């Protein structure tokens, strides 16, 4: 009511506590944060989007997130939108992106996990589900997210791109598809390697601002930005990071319950008690999260240094929390089950 207003003061900040805004948004945080973001950037008045169309689309979209799914619910999407919005404001990117590219980035973030069933691509592939058979086992969920994101523009009072030029809409579409498909975890290595290649040949003005003359460079940054935002959990204050960890473990273990229930024998998951939560977060940072953010900190040198420090501290905290009292860890002592990182990896 009025507590929402105070929390939305941290809008342009990394330290925004999205869990608090969830409680004061009447369990509707994505529409809430998206309305906030779009006003702070004057996007509604720029692209001729009325309150009616926007709210209606966001309400429709947010409702297509699963509220019973532990991690991949609308709050995660709210979190990714807000984080993306911060990253767009990064000094090294000031005046670089056009309004259509800004619109594309935040919108992509909003839809990037819509209609997520709380199971991995591989689970859908192993079960011979409709979605796997439609998308040819190829970025199954990420394709679906985009499909749903754009189909919902067709519902009543939902076309927020109504008043865009045929050209602008085509360009927006191309960018959005590109950014969201980039969120495929099996494409992480491929994407990081090219980002490194882009840093190795970076061009800047004397003030520090990056120079990205043509679309190919501009789109590559946005890909990695939304991808960083998606993988930003470990870079947040440990007050939030631990909540996200709790949530992802609940969803992942719930997938493990499904697999047993259905008697799947393709690479079985180790059940909740035998898993090593803390070492997994460490491996997660070491092999995936830190390499990507380190490369990002290079690109926006040195705007993301504070973010990078926070990450390193969080890594050392989870490392210190690894109990040596069962050695080796239980998941390594079972030749049948697979540990958290083992099952997730192999990308
Ligand atoms: C807070 O940690 C996570 C936050 C978000 C994710 C997402 C990333 N993208 C996905 O599409 N799915 C999982 C994973 C996280 O960690 C888990 C992965 C490793 C195995 C257990 C830990 C470590
Ligand atoms: Mg995802
Ligand atoms: Zn996501």
* Domain limits for position 231: 1-347
Q: Which ligand is nearest to the CA of 280?
A: 1
Q: Which residues contact 152 (CB under 8 A, 6 or more apart)?
A: 57, 60, 61, 64, 158
CATH code assigned at 14: 1.10.1300.10
Binding residues for AMP: 72, 76, 113, 230, 281, 284
User: If DSSP codes are grouped into helix, strand and coil, which group holds residue 264?
Assistant: coil
Q: Tell me the CA–centroid distance for residue 243 and ligand 1, in Å.
A: 12
Technique of determination: X-ray
CB of 30 within 8 A of CB of 110?
yes
Query: How far apart, in whole angstroms, are the C-alpha atoms of residue 143 and residue 123?
Result: 16
DSSP for 60-127?
HHHHTS-TTSSSSSHHHHHHHHHHHHHHHH-GGGTTTS-HHHHHHHHHHHHHTTTT--SS-HHHHHHT
CB of 131 within 8 A of CB of 141?
yes
Residue holding tokens 């946005």?
222
Q: Tell me the CA–centroid distance for residue 112 and ligand 3, in Å.
A: 6
Question: Beta-carbon neighbour count of residue 204 at 10 Å?
Answer: 11
Q: Tell which atom from ligand 1 comes closest to the C-alpha of 245.
A: 1
Q: Tell which atom from ligand 1 comes closest to the C-alpha of 343.
A: 20
How many domains does the chain fold into? 1
Question: 221, exposed or middle or buried, with CB in 10 Å at 0-12, 13-18, 19+?
Answer: buried
Q: Which ligand is nearest to the CA of 235?
A: 1
Could you tell me the two tokens for 294?
């380190």
Q: Tell me the CA–centroid distance for residue 232 and ligand 3, in Å.
A: 10
User: If DSSP codes are grouped into helix, strand and coil, which group holds residue 286?
Assistant: helix
| Stated resolution in angstroms | 2.5
What b/e string do you get for 115-149 counting C-beta neighbours within 10 Å, with b at 16 or more? bbbbbbbbbbbbbeeebbeebeeebbbbbbbbbbb
Given 72, 116, 144, 188, which residue is catalytic?
A: 72
Q: Tell me the CA–centroid distance for residue 229 and ligand 2, in Å.
A: 11
Q: Which ligand is nearest to the CA of 241?
A: 1
Residue 280 near ligand 1, beta carbon < 6 Å: yes
Is-catalytic flag, 144?
Answer: no
Query: How far apart, in whole angstroms, are the C-alpha atoms of residue 304 and residue 93?
Result: 12
Query: How far apart, in whole angstroms, are the C-alpha atoms of residue 162 and residue 15?
Result: 34
Tell me the torsion sign for CA atoms 343, 122, 229, 253: negative
Question: Beta-carbon neighbour count of residue 337 at 10 Å?
Answer: 19
What b/e string do you get for 263-281 counting C-beta neighbours within 10 Å, with b at 16 or more? eeeeeebbeeeebbebbbb
């Amino acid at each position: 009511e009025d507590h929402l207003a105070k929390e939305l003061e941290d809008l342009n900040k990394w330290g925004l506590n999205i869990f608090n805004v969830a409680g004061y948004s009447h369990n509707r945080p994505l529409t809430c944060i998206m309305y906030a973001i779009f006003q702070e950037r004057d996007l509604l008045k720029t692209f001729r989007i009325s309150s009616d169309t926007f709210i209606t689309y966001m309400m429709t979209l947010e409702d297509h997130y699963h509220s019973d799914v532990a991690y991949h619910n609308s709050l995660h999407a709210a979190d990714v939108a807000q984080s993306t919005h911060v990253l767009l404001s990064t000094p090294a990117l000031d005046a670089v992106f056009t309004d259509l590219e800004i619109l594309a980035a935040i919108f992509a973030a909003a839809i990037h996990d819509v209609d997520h069933p709380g199971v991995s691509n591989q689970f859908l592939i192993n079960t011979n589900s409709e979605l796997a058979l439609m998308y040819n086992d190829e970025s199954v969920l990420e394709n679906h997210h985009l499909a749903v994101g754009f189909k919902l523009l067709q519902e009543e009072h939902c076309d927020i791109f109504m008043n865009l030029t045929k050209k602008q809409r085509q360009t927006l579409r191309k960018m959005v598809i590109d950014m969201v498909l980039a969120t495929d975890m099996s494409k992480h290595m491929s994407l990081l390697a090219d980002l490194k290649t882009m840093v190795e040949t970076k061009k800047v003005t004397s003030s520090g601002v990056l120079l990205l003359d043509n679309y190919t460079d501009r789109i590559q940054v946005l890909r990695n930005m939304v991808h960083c935002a998606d993988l930003s959990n470990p870079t947040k204050s440990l007050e939030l990071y631990r909540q996200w960890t709790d949530r992802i473990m609940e969803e992942f273990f719930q997938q493990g319950d499904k697999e047993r229930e259905r008697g799947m024998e393709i690479s079985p998951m180790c059940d909740k008690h035998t898993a090593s939560v803390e070492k997994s977060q460490v491996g997660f940072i070491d092999y995936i999260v830190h390499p990507l953010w380190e490369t990002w900190a290079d690109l926006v040198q040195p705007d993301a240094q504070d973010i990078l420090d926070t990450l390193e501290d969080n890594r050392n905290w989870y490392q210190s929390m690894i109990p040596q009292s069962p050695s080796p860890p239980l998941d390594e002592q079972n030749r049948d089950c697979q540990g958290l990182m083992e099952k997730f990896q192999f990308e």
